[PDB]
Every structure is written in structure tokens, then in C-alpha cells.
Amino acid sequence: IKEMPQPKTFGELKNLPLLNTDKPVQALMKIADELGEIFKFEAPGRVTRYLSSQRLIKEACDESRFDKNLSQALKFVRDFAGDGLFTSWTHEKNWKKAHNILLPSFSQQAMKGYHAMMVDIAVQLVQKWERLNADEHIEVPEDMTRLTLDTIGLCGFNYRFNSFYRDQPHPFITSMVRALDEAMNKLQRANPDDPAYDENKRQFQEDIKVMNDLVDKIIADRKASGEQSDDLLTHMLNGKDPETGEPLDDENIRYQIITFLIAGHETTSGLLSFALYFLVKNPHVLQKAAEEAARVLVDPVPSYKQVKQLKYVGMVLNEALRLWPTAPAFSLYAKEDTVLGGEYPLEKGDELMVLIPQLHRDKTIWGDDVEEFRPERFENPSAIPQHAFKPFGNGQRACIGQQFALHEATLVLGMMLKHFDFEDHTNYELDIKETLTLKPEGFVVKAKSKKIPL
Numbered sequence: 001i002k003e004m005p006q007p008k009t010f011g012e013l014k015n016l017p018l019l020n021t022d023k024p025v026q027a028l029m030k031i032a033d034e035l036g037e038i039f040k041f042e043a044p045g046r047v048t049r050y051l052s053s054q055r056l057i058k059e060a061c062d063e064s065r066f067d068k069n070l071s072q073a074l075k076f077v078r079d080f081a082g083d084g085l086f087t088s089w090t091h092e093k094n095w096k097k098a099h100n101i102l103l104p105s106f107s108q109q110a111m112k113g114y115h116a117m118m119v120d121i122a123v124q125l126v127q128k129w130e131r132l133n134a135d136e137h138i139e140v141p142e143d144m145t146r147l148t149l150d151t152i153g154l155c156g157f158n159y160r161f162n163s164f165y166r167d168q169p170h171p172f173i174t175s176m177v178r179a180l181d182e183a184m185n186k187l188q189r190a191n192p193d194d195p196a197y198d199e200n201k202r203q204f205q206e207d208i209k210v211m212n213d214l215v216d217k218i219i220a221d222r223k224a225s226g227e228q229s230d231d232l233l234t235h236m237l238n239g240k241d242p243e244t245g246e247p248l249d250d251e252n253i254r255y256q257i258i259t260f261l262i263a264g265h266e267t268t269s270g271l272l273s274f275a276l277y278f279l280v281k282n283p284h285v286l287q288k289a290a291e292e293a294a295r296v297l298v299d300p301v302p303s304y305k306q307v308k309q310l311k312y313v314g315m316v317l318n319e320a321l322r323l324w325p326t327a328p329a330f331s332l333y334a335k336e337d338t339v340l341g342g343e344y345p346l347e348k349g350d351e352l353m354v355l356i357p358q359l360h361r362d363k364t365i366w367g368d369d370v371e372e373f374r375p376e377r378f379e380n381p382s383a384i385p386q387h388a389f390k391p392f393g394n395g396q397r398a399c400i401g402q403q404f405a406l407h408e409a410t411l412v413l414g415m416m417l418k419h420f421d422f423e424d425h426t427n428y429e430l431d432i433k434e435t436l437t438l439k440p441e442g443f444v445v446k447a448k449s450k451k452i453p454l
């Protein structure tokens, strides 16, 4: 039994000012490098413990001892994501009901049905790049976000955001980004009832209303038309939970659609951006991935079966997730009094944060080459120990979208490597912007077409 390390304090504000930064996850990573596998973090009326080692995270991932916690971030996002799957407690009736209805819509088998819609948006990206002039470059996170938002709009509810037709996001996206920004900024407000923030509160309510009205109108329009599409909205209007026998109601469907749009905007776009970053910084890896794309994607339109054969493209994605897990943390609570790691007594309800970037740098699992980008670490999935690699979270609360995200990212990265050579023309210095997720800010490349027809 051991005292937990704690970072530097600021009198009555305890550790809270350490996260008064636009890069709090990176700040916690530097704290974990200084203090090790566990540290306590105190704020007025709150204590969290940050876990970094596979030894402790494997215990935290025991669902008999720990359940998903809503972090204060997720509590603030719940003001517009409601009791959708991501912001619901495991014990809320709507969690298991939605989970049971939606699991079959997210299976590897279901990806066959979404493939044609993913191709539609991926071909729009490839055409955009084919149409750049010689003196032009690509804004990588900007284009990847146009792509993944459009893909989930089309597969989610047969709605075209038409992000490749725009400089300025669809108004829904404006309100969604600003609501996400307000949720994350509120973590840093030592005193949020100061009238200074009355404007933030009013803007936040107006952004929620924009989001509810598009989504409630889309649900209403689809029920009126009676149309049956191969999208998540049709599955949610028709599906019944085998346990309760109930379908989702319209309000909960709206929370799911908002949740899926947050995911498409924030996550897969980050993964593709990091993956392209690591490929242009590691040309041997780029050559090996481009060889696979050329050999496998032999048709102008990739098929579902061809995407499944892009093994090395999948290893590149996993290695990018290892170094920069675009969703960088998840929160747990102790279901009962327990001892973590034989050393750290916890009380029922005590909150843990898993720092996924630190888990993925545990040299006792990965070896001393942990900072190097080496997709070959993933050549043999069996060799990865349990709970060493957690970019999609844990157990029954793991990412329902994992097969969707990886199918889209593999398809798109495959097509990018088939169609273009890439240049790191600025010698880009990695600068990681934080929202809910991580993205490489300002990452730009030049593409040179291989002149292969679509």
C-alpha cells in the first residue's frame, strides 16, 4: 500500500490550473512522464486518478470491478448528446436498449451495406485532389474532416452535408463545433456563474436548438415519407430491443444521430490525418503501403472485399492509433471498494482516467523503440497483449463505431495511396490541436497524381 504521486499545486485551486491550457491531454502526458504509472489530480470538490501503465489499466478494464464513468467533459457534452450511447451511464435503460438495437447496424457484416456510400464520399476527396493545380497544397485535417463528416451524414441518415462544395461548414456543423468548444472550455472555468459567461450560455442554448431542429426535422421528414433506406435512421425507426421489446423513441434517436455526427467530425478525420502525417515522415512505410494499395485496388471503384485485403494499410492505421489515439482518454468508476495493483486502495465511486497515449508508450509492452512509427509491430495481432492497445475503449462500453471507422479509414487511405504520391513540402512540425479529440493542426502536403482513372 503506497501513497500516489501528485503534481504541483496552486493553493486552494489544488491541481486545477495545470489544465488551464489549449492542450490539457498533452499536459497530462508530460505529468505522466514525470510521475509514472498513476497520479492523483485534485480540483475544488473533485479527485481523479490518471493511469498510464498496462499493469494498472488491465485492472481498470475488469468490468466486474470498474464501469464507464462520464468525465466532466462527457457530462457537458450530454447537454446536447443526451442519453445517446456515448453520454449514457451503463445503468440507464436507454444505454442497453440502444446498444441492443444498434449493434447489428455496426457489425463487420453491416459494413457491406455502407461501403457504396463511403465510396461516394472517398471518390469526392480523390477528385478534389486530382483537380488541384501544380502550385497548390492540401489542408489535411480540413479535407479529412469534410470526408468523415460527409460519410456519417450519408450512412447515418442519407443527408449530404456537401462539405466538398463549401469553404464554410454547414450551419449544423458550426453549432456542433461551437457546442463542443463550450463543453471543453467549461472544464477550465474556476467559477462559471460569473455573468461574464452569460453570452457563452446564450450561444450554447442557440447551438443546441440549431442541432435539435435539423435532426428532429430529418427524423420527422423520414417518418412522413415512409422511405426505407440502408441507413442508421431506418434501422432506429424499425428496430426493437429484444430485451424490452421497445423501439427507440424520436428524442433518443435524435441523441444517437447527434452522437454519430460528433464521432464522424472528431475521430476518423484525426486518425486519417495522423496516418498521412506518419506516412510522409516515414517514406519506407509509405512505399510499402502504396505497394499494397496498387496491388489490391485493381478496379476503379474499390469493393468491400478489396478493402478487407489492405492488411498493411490496417497496420499503418493501428500504429497511428498507437502513437496518437485521436480519442485520447476514457473514464472509469470503482463499482465497490477495491485495491488497484495491490498498492492503491480505492473507494466505491472513485474516478479513474485512462491516458491512452501513455498506455501506448509503456516500454514494458512495446520495447525501447516506443516513439518510432513501425506498422510492423501489428503484423501479428496475437503478439499484442490484452489491454495494451485501447484506442476504441473497453468492453461493452467500447466504440460501437470501430468497424465503421476502420472500414472508412482503410478504404480512404487505400485510395489516397493508389492515386497520389505525397510530399511533406513544408517539413511540417507536428502541432496537435485538442477538442474532444486530437488532430494535427496546420498539416499540409502536396500530392502528385499517379494519373489512374476513377
Ligand code: HEM
Pocket (backbone or CB within 6 Å): 068, 085, 086, 087, 099, 152, 259, 260, 263, 264, 267, 268, 271, 325, 326, 327, 329, 330, 331, 390, 391, 392, 393, 394, 396, 397, 398, 399, 400, 401, 402, 404, 405, 406
Ligand atoms: C477512429 C475513429 C474512432 C475512435 C478512435 C473512437 C473511439 C472511441 C472510444 C475511445 C470510445 C469509448 C468512450 C468512453 O469509454 O468514454 C468510443 C465510444 C463510442 N464511439 Fe467511437 N471512435 C471512433 C469512431 C466512431 C464512429 C465512426 C462512431 C459512429 C459512427 C462512433 C461511435 C461511438 C459510440 C456511439 C460510442 C459509445 C459506445 C457505447 O458506450 O455504447 N465512434 N469511441
Ligand SMILES: O=C(CCCCC1CCCCC1)N[C@@H](Cc1ccccc1)C(=O)O
Pocket (backbone or CB within 6 Å): 019, 024, 025, 043, 046, 048, 070, 071, 072, 073, 074, 187, 188, 327, 328, 329, 330, 331, 353, 436, 437
Ligand atoms: O482529464 C480531463 C481533461 C482531458 C479530457 C479528455 C477527454 C474528453 C472526453 C473525450 C476523450 C478525451 N478531464 C477530466 C478531469 C477534469 C474534470 C474537471 C475539470 C478538469 C479536469 C474530466 O473531464 O472529468
